[PDB]
Structure formats: C-alpha cells, structure tokens
Design a protein around this ligand. Structure first.
Ligand SMILES: C[C@H](CCC(=O)O)[C@H]1CC[C@H]2[C@@H]3[C@H](O)C[C@@H]4C[C@H](O)CC[C@]4(C)[C@H]3C[C@H](O)[C@]12C
Ligand SMILES: C[C@H](CCC(=O)O)[C@H]1CC[C@H]2[C@@H]3[C@H](O)C[C@@H]4C[C@H](O)CC[C@]4(C)[C@H]3C[C@H](O)[C@]12C
Ligand SMILES: C[C@H](CCC(=O)O)[C@H]1CC[C@H]2[C@@H]3[C@H](O)C[C@@H]4C[C@H](O)CC[C@]4(C)[C@H]3C[C@H](O)[C@]12C
Ligand SMILES: C[C@H](CCC(=O)O)[C@H]1CC[C@H]2[C@@H]3[C@H](O)C[C@@H]4C[C@H](O)CC[C@]4(C)[C@H]3C[C@H](O)[C@]12C
Length: 131
C-alpha cells in the first residue's frame, strides 16, 4: 500500500539535459520546466494502476503486476511489453537504452530515470509530494 494515492511533482533534477538528450527542442524545454505532473496510483499489493495527468486531459494509465510481463503505453501512445520488478520496495524497469527506479523516500515519490542518446546518457530525478 506504500505507493497508494495522489502525488504532485515538486522537483525535477536533471530535467533540461535529460530532455535535450532525447530530442526535445529547447524552446519547449523552457516552457516545460514549470509543468508539474500529477500521478495517481492504486496499489493492491503487487497489482498497480499508475495514472499520469498530462496537459489537455491526456490521461495515461498503465496497469502492471510486479515481476510479470505487462502491456504498457507511453505518453505518445506507443504500446510495449515490460516487466516491473520490486527490489526492496523499489519498482524497477530496464531496457538497453532506458532504466527507471521508482521508490517512496521520506514520504515522497522519487522517480530516477536514465536514458541513452547519441551524446551519451542523462539522468532525471523526479520527486513528487503527497497531495
Ligand atoms: C514540455 C511539455 C509541456 C507542453 C509544452 O510545453 O508544449 C511536456 C509535456 C509532456 C512531457 C514529456 C512526457 O512527460 C514524457 C517524458 C517524461 C520524462 O520523465 C521526461 C521527458 C518526457 C519526454 C517529457 C518532456 C516534457 O516535459 C513534455 C514534452
Ligand atoms: C518511458 C516513458 C516516458 C517517455 C515516453 O513517454 O515515451 C514513461 C511514461 C510512463 C512510464 C511508466 C508508468 O509510470 C508506469 C510504470 C511506473 C513504474 O514506477 C515504473 C515502470 C512504468 C511502466 C513506467 C515506465 C516508463 O518510465 C514510462 C512508460
Ligand atoms: C501522437 C498523439 C496522437 C494520438 C495517436 O496518434 O496515437 C498526440 C495527441 C495528444 C498529444 C498529447 C497532448 O496534446 C498533451 C501534450 C501536449 C504538448 O503540446 C505535447 C505533449 C503532449 C503530452 C501530447 C503528446 C502527443 O503529441 C499526443 C499524445
Ligand atoms: C525499449 C522500449 C520498447 C520495448 C518493446 O519493444 O516492447 C521503448 C518503448 C518506448 C521507448 C521510449 C520512447 O521512445 C521515448 C524516449 C525516446 C528517447 O530517444 C530514448 C528514451 C525513451 C524514453 C524511450 C526508451 C525506450 O527505448 C522505450 C521505453
């Protein structure tokens, strides 16, 4: 039940280098920095429903079972299959060019992603507070 509830972005460390690495144009990075994503999580043990509230009523819902291959969807609508493991309370997914670790730390939702681009890699640390 640890991840349960509604969360709101308070900080995004590495935000601009991360966005720059993955092709986002600089003008929209500068506009995008003040956007604070709201996340709603229903966790029933190993069963998760992860909802992100993007601009313009663009609700992105991902459902998964921990340690079991699950159908997932990106912000752009790309469907893919993935496995979210839990390692000491930390949710984790790994691809050859992408990794994410999500945890509850100091009562906050902390999301750490790493991506490969042509320049090298970039790391984003997003921290959300409970609403
Ligand atoms: C900047 C933009 C806000 C709308 C705008 O300014 O036009 C926001 C809305 C959706 C955001 C993207 C989506 O959240 C998907 C990605 C999530 C990653 O954690 C950061 C990069 C990432 C690719 C985001 C970059 C940027 O913050 C976007 C593109
Ligand atoms: C990689 C992508 C951001 C870039 C994009 O939109 O293409 C983001 C948007 C939604 C994210 C997923 C959703 O938050 C649902 C899952 C949440 C877990 O905490 C990690 C895996 C998890 C399956 C995430 C993997 C990945 O970081 C996703 C798919
Ligand atoms: C590509 C997709 C169209 C649906 C599809 O073809 O599957 C479009 C329509 C809705 C768009 C999203 C929404 O308009 C909300 C966001 C608006 C921002 O200007 C860019 C990111 C943003 C998160 C968009 C990403 C992407 O361009 C979406 C997902
Ligand atoms: C590898 C995986 C596809 C898995 C599958 O084929 O089932 C893909 C699906 C959507 C991809 C993500 C999206 O294309 C958006 C991002 C694009 C950047 O150029 C790399 C990171 C980035 C965040 C991608 C990481 C990774 O390559 C993802 C998560």
């Amino acid at each position: 039940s640890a991840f349960n509830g509604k969360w709101e972005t308070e900080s995004q460390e590495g935000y601009e280098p991360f966005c720059k690495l993955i092709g986002i144009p600089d003008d929209v990075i500068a506009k995008g920095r003040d956007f604070k994503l709201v996340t709603e999580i229903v966790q029933n043990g190993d069963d998760f429903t992860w909802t992100q509230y993007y601009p313009n009523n663009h609700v992105v819902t991902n459902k998964f079972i921990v340690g079991k291959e699950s159908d997932m969807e990106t912000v752009g609508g790309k469907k893919f299959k993935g496995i979210v493991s839990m390692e000491g309370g930390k949710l984790t997914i790994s691809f050859p060019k992408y990794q994410q670790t999500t945890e509850i730390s100091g009562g906050k939702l902390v999301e750490t992603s790493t991506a490969s681009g042509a320049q090298g890699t970039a790391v984003l640390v997003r921290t959300s507070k409970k609403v």
